[PDB]
Amino acid sequence: MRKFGVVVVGVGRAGSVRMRDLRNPHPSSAFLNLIGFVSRRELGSIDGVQQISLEDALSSQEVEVAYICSESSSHEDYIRQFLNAGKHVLVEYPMTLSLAAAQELWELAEQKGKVLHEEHVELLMEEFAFLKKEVVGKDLLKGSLLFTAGPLEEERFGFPAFSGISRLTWLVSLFGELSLVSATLEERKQYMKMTVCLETEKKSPLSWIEEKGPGLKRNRYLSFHFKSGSLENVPNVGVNKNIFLKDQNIFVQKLLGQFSEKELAAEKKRILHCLGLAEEIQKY
Amino acid sequence: RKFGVVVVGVGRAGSVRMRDLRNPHPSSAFLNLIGFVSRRELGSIDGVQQISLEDALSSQEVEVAYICSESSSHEDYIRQFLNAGKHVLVEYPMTLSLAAAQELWELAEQKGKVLHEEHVELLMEEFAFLKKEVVGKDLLKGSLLFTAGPLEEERFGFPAFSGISRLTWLVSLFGELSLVSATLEERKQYMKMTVCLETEKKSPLSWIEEKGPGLKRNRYLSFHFKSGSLENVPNVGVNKNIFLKDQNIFVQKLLGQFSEKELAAEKKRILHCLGLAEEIQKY
Ligand SMILES: NC(=O)c1ccc[n+]([C@@H]2O[C@H](COP(=O)([O-])OP(=O)(O)OC[C@H]3O[C@@H](n4cnc5c(N)ncnc54)[C@H](OP(=O)(O)O)[C@@H]3O)[C@@H](O)[C@H]2O)c1
Numbered sequence: 164m165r166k167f168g169v170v171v172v173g174v175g176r177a178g179s180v181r182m183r184d185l186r187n188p189h190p191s192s193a194f195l196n197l198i199g200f201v202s203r204r205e206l207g208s209i210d211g212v213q214q215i216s217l218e219d220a221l222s223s224q225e226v227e228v229a230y231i232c233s234e235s236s237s238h239e240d241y242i243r244q245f246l247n248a249g250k251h252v253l254v255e256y257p258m259t260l261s262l263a264a265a266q267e268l269w270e271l272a273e274q275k276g277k278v279l280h281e282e283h284v285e286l287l288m289e290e291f292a293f294l295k296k297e298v299v300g301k302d303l304l305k306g307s308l309l310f311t312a313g314p315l316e317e318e319r320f321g322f323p324a325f326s327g328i329s330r331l332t333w334l335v336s337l338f339g340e341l342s343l344v345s346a347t348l349e350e351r352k353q354y355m356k357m358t359v360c361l362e363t364e365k366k367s368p369l370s371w372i373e374e375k376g377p378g379l380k381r382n383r384y385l386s387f388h389f390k391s392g393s394l395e396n397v398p399n400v401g402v403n404k405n406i407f408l409k410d411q412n413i414f415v416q417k418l419l420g421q422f423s424e425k426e427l428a429a430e431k432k433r434i435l436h437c438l439g440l441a442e443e444i445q446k447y
Numbered sequence: 448r449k450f451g452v453v454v455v456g457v458g459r460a461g462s463v464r465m466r467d468l469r470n471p472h473p474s475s476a477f478l479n480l481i482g483f484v485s486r487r488e489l490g491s492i493d494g495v496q497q498i499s500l501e502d503a504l505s506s507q508e509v510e511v512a513y514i515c516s517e518s519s520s521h522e523d524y525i526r527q528f529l530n531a532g533k534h535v536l537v538e539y540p541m542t543l544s545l546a547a548a549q550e551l552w553e554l555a556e557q558k559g560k561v562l563h564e565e566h567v568e569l570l571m572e573e574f575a576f577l578k579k580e581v582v583g584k585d586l587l588k589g590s591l592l593f594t595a596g597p598l599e600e601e602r603f604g605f606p607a608f609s610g611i612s613r614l615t616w617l618v619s620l621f622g623e624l625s626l627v628s629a630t631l632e633e634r635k636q637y638m639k640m641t642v643c644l645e646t647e648k649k650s651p652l653s654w655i656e657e658k659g660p661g662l663k664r665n666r667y668l669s670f671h672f673k674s675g676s677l678e679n680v681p682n683v684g685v686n687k688n689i690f691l692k693d694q695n696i697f698v699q700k701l702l703g704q705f706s707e708k709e710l711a712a713e714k715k716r717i718l719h720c721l722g723l724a725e726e727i728q729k730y
């Protein structure tokens with residue numbers, strides 16, 4: 164059995180889940196081989212997995228795939244280094260905090276012949292499976308999505324339109340490419356609220372709000388209105404199941420060339436579309 | 448805006464279905480389990496009420512029938528519910544003859560409803576893996592053995608049908624297959640079916656179903672390619688809601704989320720297998 168060598172860079176929340184998924188038996192994982200991890204800190208060994216240096220990780224012929232799971236701000240730096248070193252790259256969203264940087268990195272992967280992949284577990288959640296099915300038949304009059312959470316260090320996870328690009332990705336996936344009508348932002352040092360206004364190609368208004376402050380329980384609130392009727396809640400649709408694993412599975416399919424050019428292009432377009440809006444929003 | 452569902456036949460399959468309908472899941476959000484139908488008088492499984500075949504066919508409220516009874520009665524129930532105007536999900540094998548399947552597909556088509564043969568075996572982790580391993584390859588020779596306990600042929604049918612799941616793997620992994628030969632041993636409480644198939648590129652696949660007492664339900668698999676071989680599926684973890692996952696495909700059909708191209712490819716495959724099961728039963 165021919166397995167790709169993997170190293171997980173940044174052993175945080177995201178990183179731990181990846182290591183655990185690699186180490187447990189699954190179809191995706193059968194094709195991979197976790198050779199070690201890279202951390203800014205001196206950890207030694209997580210689950211019999213050894214720490215290894217950035218230096219030795221880029222060097223190694225054994226290592227063919229880098230999972231970048233560090234804070235958003237360092238993503239761009241690491242992606243570039245691993246692509247230049249000749250490795251395939253999986254990176255958690257947002258892949259970068261600028262459109263131009265994303266463009267450069269895709270173009271580099273393309274040139275170096277490797278897969279670059281922005282993880283999007285939000286598209287694999289139950290809540291979204293349901294919405295994908297509910298929206299199918301419909302023509303949206305107006306709609307709104309609010310996400311609340313605790314404070315987040317912008318110096319390392321970036322501006323909220325980037326840190327919450329997942330919410331945007333929903334709206335884009337559900338309703339096509341969107342354009343920016345306006346965007347306001349309140350800050351107050353440890354609170355913050357971002358109010359965005361988007362339109363769909365058929366010119367119908369979507370509202371997007373991210374609120375982050377202390378005492379705020381991570382939550383999602385959603386309301387869609389169509390010509391046929393409205394949806395005020397997602398109903399109880401059960402708990403999310405291995406969203407990260409599932410994303411690994413898409414990545415391995417890429418490594419194996421199981422997706423079409425048509426498909427890989429649609430995805431690239433979408434990712435850039437969002438990164439761009441995040442930027443357009445941050446300007447306004 | 449939920450479809451009314453009734454589960455016909457409360458066995459192992461039927462229990463799973465009712466549990467999955469009762470629990471909160473994306474699929475299920477679109478369905479509404481109205482009742483079940485049983486040859487026996489059960490009363491109420493989980494606050495779900497028993498309802499007659501008669502009142503089940505009558506009801507405007509009931510729009511979908513899940514047929515989960517023994518394979519022998521599938522063809523009977525499918526026809527009745529399709530005639531009564533209901534969409535139909537049926538567990539494999541949908542029928543025990545090619546001809547019957549063709550008629551029932553043609554009936555659904557004419558009545559404008561979805562008919563769906565369940566194939567949870569395509570949703571197993573073991574298959575997820577094979578789907579990826581096979582992708583790059585050119586198969587020299589290959590073999591698949593499945594063992595289990597005895598099974599009443601009068602009610603689950605001939606083994607090529609009761610194990611059409613195994614065939615559906617080989618077909619799904621290696622394209623449409625042809626029959627070169629097929630032998631069968633019996634000693635009444637034991638049985639072994641040895642089949643030989645070829646792929647379009649004319650390379651040999653062996654398929655064996657063994658059923659007898661004291662035999663632990665098991666699968667054994669060996670593929671040889673021009674590049675190398677595969678003697679085991681490695682530990683790939685346990686299966687996860689294969690039935691729910693099938694329901695999901697069914698609902699996607701109810702919402703028309705699949706293309707004509709896709710729905711066609713699936714009908715073709717299903718019939719290709721039912722046909723082979725028949726050609727094997729002949730020989
Ligand atoms: N985890 C999720 O649920 C999730 C979901 C979607 C997207 N993401 C994305 O995934 C990336 C990482 O998110 P995350 O939630 O994993 O970030 P995190 O838990 O805050 O960890 C990020 C980084 O913190 C460093 N670190 C410093 N002190 C640490 C400590 N005491 N414990 C753990 N790590 C520490 C690690 O780098 P070193 O090991 O080198 O120090 C680690 O890579 C972000 O780009 C985020 O946008 C995460």
Ligand SMILES: NC(=O)c1ccc[n+]([C@@H]2O[C@H](COP(=O)([O-])OP(=O)(O)OC[C@H]3O[C@@H](n4cnc5c(N)ncnc54)[C@H](OP(=O)(O)O)[C@@H]3O)[C@@H](O)[C@H]2O)c1
Nearest residue numbers: 456457458459460461485486487515516517518538539540
């Ligand atoms: N088991 C699986 O994992 C599985 C997987 C794929 C396909 N299938 C297919 O599922 C269909 C049924 O298979 P199955 O495994 O569910 O068969 P099963 O559990 O033996 O049930 C079949 C029928 O037996 C009747 N029955 C009579 N007495 C019973 C009792 N005491 N307890 C439970 N049921 C009793 C039930 O009908 P009444 O309620 O009307 O009495 C039930 O519908 C077949 O086509 C099989 O090929 C099963």
